[PDB]
Amino acid sequence: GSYIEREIKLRVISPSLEEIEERIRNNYTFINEEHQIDIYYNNPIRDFRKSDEALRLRNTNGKVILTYKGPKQSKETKTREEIEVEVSDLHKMDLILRKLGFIRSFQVEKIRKNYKYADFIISLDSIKELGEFIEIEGINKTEKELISFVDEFVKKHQIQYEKTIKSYLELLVEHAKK
């Protein structure tokens, strides 16, 4: 019951996400907008920052999702095992995790606008306190195919960018101490 999430994450340098949305509006199909508030957790005895694991409880437009992510499997894209379940109650799931000994680590909040283009999901991310990013995830795609599509995507829409395989959680920590 596991799945490999493969995506590329771009920090947007120019233009604004609003202007990018205008550029893709006509050829990409809008899916939905998600307001996502994420709580991350650590295990006191198994520093997830050493094993490169993550446990997250997400509220996305009121839907509550518990996610495990495993260590990164690539240096060219952000590739990780991901296991997710929907749960009925966020407060109670958080209570269970804390009763089991997990400790709340950090919180990430964003507005995400999802677009679809031929088995690719393009997410325009406005991250509280971090700024503007784009993620592209592949549906039954090889790493090569994803990398090639992203190169075509940024070129077609004249986006200036920096790629990274750091998570938003990791980028948030870097940003705080600066």
Binding-site entries for Ca(2+): 5, 7, 135, 137
**Beta carbons of 49 and 41 less than 8 angstroms apart:** no
3-state secondary structure of 139: coil
Residue 55 binds to a copy of itself (criterion: CB under 8 A) = yes
Stretch that binds a copy of itself, among 42-50, 117-125, 132-140, 159-167 (CB under 8 A): 42-50
Nearest distance from residue 76's CB to a copy of itself, in Å?
A: 25
Q: Which helix (H) or strand (E) holds 153?
A: helix 143-156
- Compare residues 12 and 57 and give the one whose CB is closer to a copy of itself: 57
Told to judge if 40 belongs to the known catalytic residues of this protein, a careful annotator would answer yes
29-42/63-72 β-pairing: unpaired
- Compare residues 102 and 115 and give the one whose CB is closer to a copy of itself: 102
3-14/29-42 β-pairing: unpaired
- Compare residues 81 and 145 and give the one whose CB is closer to a copy of itself: 81
Backbone angles phi, psi at 169, to 5 degrees: -55, -50
Stretch that binds a copy of itself, among 27-35, 41-49, 145-153, 158-166 (CB under 8 A): 41-49
How far is Cα 79 from Cα 143, in angstroms, rounded to an integer? 9
* Cα 14–Cα 18–Cα 19 angle in degrees, nearest 5: 55
Q: Tell me the catalytic residues.
A: 40
Note the residues at the interface with a copy of itself (CB under 8 A). 1-2, 43, 45-46, 53, 55, 66, 68, 70, 83-89, 91-93, 95-96, 99-101
